[PDB]
Write an enzyme that holds these catalytic residues in place. Structure first.
Site, mmCIF file in Angstrom:
data_model
loop_
_atom_site.group_PDB
_atom_site.id
_atom_site.type_symbol
_atom_site.label_atom_id
_atom_site.label_comp_id
_atom_site.label_asym_id
_atom_site.label_seq_id
_atom_site.Cartn_x
_atom_site.Cartn_y
_atom_site.Cartn_z
ATOM 1 N N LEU A 18 0.804 -1.022 0.056
ATOM 2 C CA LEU A 18 0.032 0.005 0.083
ATOM 3 C C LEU A 18 0.882 1.261 0.129
ATOM 4 C CD1 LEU A 18 -2.886 -0.884 2.355
ATOM 5 C CD2 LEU A 18 -2.884 -0.903 -0.179
ATOM 6 N N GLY A 19 2.157 1.187 0.225
ATOM 7 C CA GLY A 19 2.894 2.306 0.351
ATOM 8 C C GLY A 19 4.303 1.981 0.780
ATOM 9 N N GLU A 20 5.436 2.872 0.584
ATOM 10 C CA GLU A 20 6.405 2.594 1.038
ATOM 11 C C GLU A 20 7.051 4.050 1.719
ATOM 12 O OE1 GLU A 20 9.555 0.443 -0.715
ATOM 13 O OE2 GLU A 20 8.329 -0.272 -2.301
ATOM 14 N N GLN A 22 9.893 6.150 4.715
ATOM 15 C CA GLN A 22 11.533 6.163 4.902
ATOM 16 C C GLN A 22 11.754 5.114 6.230
ATOM 17 O OE1 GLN A 22 14.224 6.617 6.804
ATOM 18 N NE2 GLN A 22 15.475 8.298 6.208
ATOM 19 N N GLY A 24 9.603 2.529 6.586
ATOM 20 C CA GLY A 24 9.114 1.143 6.215
ATOM 21 C C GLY A 24 8.249 1.237 5.232
ATOM 22 N N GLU A 25 7.091 0.073 5.172
ATOM 23 C CA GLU A 25 6.298 0.028 4.184
ATOM 24 C C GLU A 25 4.689 -0.388 4.879
ATOM 25 O OE1 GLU A 25 7.513 -3.331 1.570
ATOM 26 O OE2 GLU A 25 9.100 -2.135 0.691
ATOM 27 N N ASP A 154 -3.814 17.482 14.429
ATOM 28 C CA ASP A 154 -3.783 17.396 13.042
ATOM 29 C C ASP A 154 -5.067 16.923 12.139
ATOM 30 O OD1 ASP A 154 -2.596 17.900 10.523
ATOM 31 O OD2 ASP A 154 -1.136 16.451 10.702
ATOM 32 N N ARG A 158 -7.356 14.902 5.082
ATOM 33 C CA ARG A 158 -6.349 14.174 4.505
ATOM 34 C C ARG A 158 -5.943 13.119 5.506
ATOM 35 N NH1 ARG A 158 -4.375 19.049 6.063
ATOM 36 N NH2 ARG A 158 -3.193 18.837 7.951
ATOM 37 N N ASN A 159 -6.349 13.310 6.918
ATOM 38 C CA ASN A 159 -6.038 12.449 8.053
ATOM 39 C C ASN A 159 -7.523 11.570 8.533
ATOM 40 O OD1 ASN A 159 -3.175 12.420 8.858
ATOM 41 N ND2 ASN A 159 -3.739 14.317 9.810
ATOM 42 N N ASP A 172 -4.208 9.254 11.454
ATOM 43 C CA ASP A 172 -3.110 10.145 11.847
ATOM 44 C C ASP A 172 -1.894 9.852 10.980
ATOM 45 O OD1 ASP A 172 -1.322 12.252 12.172
ATOM 46 O OD2 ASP A 172 -1.167 12.119 14.402
HETATM 47 C C1 LIG Z 1 3.055 9.117 18.582
HETATM 48 C C2 LIG Z 1 1.391 9.118 17.824
HETATM 49 C C3 LIG Z 1 0.790 8.419 17.246
HETATM 50 N N1 LIG Z 1 -0.569 8.984 16.882
HETATM 51 C C4 LIG Z 1 -1.567 8.391 16.288
HETATM 52 C C5 LIG Z 1 -1.222 7.656 15.319
HETATM 53 C C6 LIG Z 1 -2.280 6.819 14.455
HETATM 54 N N2 LIG Z 1 -1.845 6.206 13.221
HETATM 55 C C7 LIG Z 1 -2.659 5.935 12.132
HETATM 56 O O1 LIG Z 1 -3.617 6.439 11.972
HETATM 57 C C8 LIG Z 1 -2.032 4.815 11.294
HETATM 58 C C9 LIG Z 1 -1.293 3.653 11.679
HETATM 59 C C10 LIG Z 1 -0.806 2.794 10.918
HETATM 60 C C11 LIG Z 1 -1.264 2.860 9.324
HETATM 61 C C12 LIG Z 1 -2.024 3.976 8.858
HETATM 62 C C13 LIG Z 1 -2.310 4.966 9.886
HETATM 63 C C14 LIG Z 1 -2.235 3.803 7.732
HETATM 64 C C15 LIG Z 1 -2.114 2.561 7.292
HETATM 65 N N3 LIG Z 1 -3.537 1.877 7.369
HETATM 66 C C16 LIG Z 1 -4.428 2.082 6.278
HETATM 67 C C17 LIG Z 1 -5.640 1.319 6.498
HETATM 68 N N4 LIG Z 1 -6.612 1.551 5.540
HETATM 69 C C18 LIG Z 1 -6.111 2.205 4.594
HETATM 70 N N5 LIG Z 1 -5.071 2.926 4.245
HETATM 71 C C19 LIG Z 1 -4.157 2.882 5.103
HETATM 72 C C20 LIG Z 1 -1.091 1.830 8.460
HETATM 73 C C21 LIG Z 1 -3.520 7.365 14.526
HETATM 74 C C22 LIG Z 1 -3.899 8.451 15.726
HETATM 75 C C23 LIG Z 1 -5.392 8.731 16.104
HETATM 76 F F1 LIG Z 1 -6.043 7.887 15.773
HETATM 77 F F2 LIG Z 1 -5.637 9.377 16.987
HETATM 78 F F3 LIG Z 1 -5.828 9.791 14.902
HETATM 79 C C24 LIG Z 1 -3.046 9.101 16.425
HETATM 80 C C25 LIG Z 1 -0.186 10.124 17.881
HETATM 81 N N6 LIG Z 1 0.703 10.472 18.286
#
Ligand SMILES: Cc1cn(-c2cc(NC(=O)c3ccc4c(c3)C[C@H](Nc3cncnc3)C4)cc(C(F)(F)F)c2)cn1
Length: 297
Positions: A18-20, A22, A24-25, A154, A158-159, A172
């Site tokens: 789904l993406g790469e 810096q 990881g993937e 944030d 886009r998030n 995020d």
């Molecule tokens: C230090 C720290 C971390 N966070 C934080 C981190 C997150 N992290 C993510 O939202 C996250 C994690 C892993 C992956 C993805 C997104 C995209 C991909 N999956 C994907 C699925 N489906 C379609 N495309 C892609 C793999 C979320 C939040 C939240 F929830 F609060 F907003 C907060 C705040 N501070």
């Protein structure tokens, strides 16, 4: 982490990158017979003999101590978040390398891309009450984060990620996608901030609160009603956005508000304006915002 055991690695069948990045993937994977691995408060809608799709974020096997520390910090924060409208951490693989975190998969990508591909009601279309429901889901997700005393910092379309049937998951991505480099402003050659979504008090004093998340939600609501056709404050340079934040602080009526979207009735635009109130205490809580968007609007 909150999972007590690593997700079994052999149960993830690779389907597609789904993406790469810096560090990881991200891999799209299938999980057969997922009922024994998936928490009971998470829906499984798989036919007999059909697998669950999940997203697997994998840290480079030569990552630094720092990148590994950042990865595990992201795991711990995600492990706390259990809501229908927040991305879900389904599992982790952290007892051995490479480090993995497993999330639910939202097949329609981020909300900004999703709305860009829709026209207002040809190709795929979307209507005003559907846009309200999109924003109500975001507000519901944010109301939950507020009860955890968790500041997103944030929020923007886009998030947000879009699953089936217009279900919205707040997420995020960090600041790790070239596609959205223009939505961030670098301060003094170091950190990068989403100034067009930030409350004047975030810009000027660096104070982040649920109240500034409410401000961000107002910009995010503006995006939704614009069908993401225009960057917020697109007419202003980054320096003008920062000066506009000075005008909010001085409150002399020279500050610039985002304009009413064509598809936005006046009562709803008035709710957005209250999200940009100069005083934090006069911005509506997410519980009030979700109520309005799920009913009154
Ligand atoms: C230090 C720290 C971390 N966070 C934080 C981190 C997150 N992290 C993510 O939202 C996250 C994690 C892993 C992956 C993805 C997104 C995209 C991909 N999956 C994907 C699925 N489906 C379609 N495309 C892609 C793999 C979320 C939040 C939240 F929830 F609060 F907003 C907060 C705040 N501070």
């Amino acid at each position: 982490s909150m999972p007590r055991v690593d997700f079994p690695r052999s149960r993830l069948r690779f389907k597609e990158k789904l993406g790469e990045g810096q560090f990881g993937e991200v891999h799209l994977c299938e999980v057969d017979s997922p009922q024994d691995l998936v928490s009971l408060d998470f829906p499984l809608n798989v036919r007999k003999g059909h697998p669950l799709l999940v997203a697997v974020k994998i840290l480079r096997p030569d990552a630094t101590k720092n990148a590994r520390n950042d990865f595990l910090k992201e795991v711990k924060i995600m492990s706390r978040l259990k809501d229908p409208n927040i991305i879900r951490l389904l599992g982790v693989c952290v007892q051995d390398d490479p480090l993995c975190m497993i999330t639910d998969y939202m097949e329609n990508g981020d909300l900004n891309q999703f709305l860009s591909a829709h026209q207002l009601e040809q190709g795929p279309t979307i209507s005003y009450p559907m846009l309200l429901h999109v924003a109500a889901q975001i507000a519901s997700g944010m109301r939950y984060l507020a009860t955890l005393n968790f500041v997103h910092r944030d929020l923007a379309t886009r998030n947000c990620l879009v699953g089936e049937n217009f279900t919205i998951k707040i997420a995020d991505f960090g600041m790790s996608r070239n596609l959205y480099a223009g939505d961030y402003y670098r301060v003094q050659g170091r950190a990068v901030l989403p100034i067009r979504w930030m409350a004047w008090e975030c810009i000027l004093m660096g104070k982040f609160t649920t109240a500034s998340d409410v401000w961000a939600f107002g910009v995010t609501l503006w995006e939704v009603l614009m069908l993401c056709r225009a960057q917020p404050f697109g007419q202003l340079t980054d320096e003008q956005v920062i000066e506009n934040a000075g005008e909010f602080f001085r409150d002399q009526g020279r500050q610039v508000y985002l304009s009413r979207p064509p598809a936005c009735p006046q009562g709803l635009y008035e709710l957005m304006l209250r999200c940009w109130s100069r005083e934090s205490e006069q911005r509506p809580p997410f519980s009030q915002l979700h109520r309005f968007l799920a009913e009154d609007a």
